[PDB]
Amino acid sequence: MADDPSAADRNVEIWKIKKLIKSLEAARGNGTSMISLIIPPKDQISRVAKMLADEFGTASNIKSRVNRLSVLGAITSVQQRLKLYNKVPPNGLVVYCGTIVTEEGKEKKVNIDFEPFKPINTSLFLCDNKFHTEALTALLSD
């Protein structure tokens, strides 16, 4: 709000990313493809979707349906995910996805895309088990 400085709305965002990431790397799905794509604010979403496209053609060409199936879930999640924004802030754009699993024997996909900490000209595209970014590990490590 206007009553508080920019650090207010900032501390919050950085809190949600540093809060989930922490508890995220601690517990993740036993078997799921976590998508992680980070890009600087020096780009346009339009180009983003394009990439998400070629992806489908990749996991699809695979012989194991487990490729087109899994990616199909995340690919379709992130796709429409970004579309819910269109234009990201000057802080850049970093999409995150990951399906967790409950001890009771449940599973859920909680993917959230939003500008990272600061407008870093860095980047990283690769689906792993946990969000791999020098940013989250930067503030966390300190």
Q: In residues, how long is the chain?
A: 142
User: Using CA atoms, how far apart are residues 103 and 125, in angstroms rounded to an integer?
Assistant: 30
Query: Cα(127)–Cα(36) distance, rounded to whole angstroms?
Result: 5
> Which experimental method was this entry solved with?
NMR
Residue indicated by tokens 């300190």? 142
Per-residue 3-state assignment (H helix, E strand, C coil) for 98-123: CEEEECCCEEEECCEEECCCCCCCCC
10 in Cβ contact with 18 (< 8 Å): no
- Into which CATH architecture does domain 1-142 fall? 2-Layer Sandwich (3.30)
Pairing of strands 36-39, 112-114: unpaired
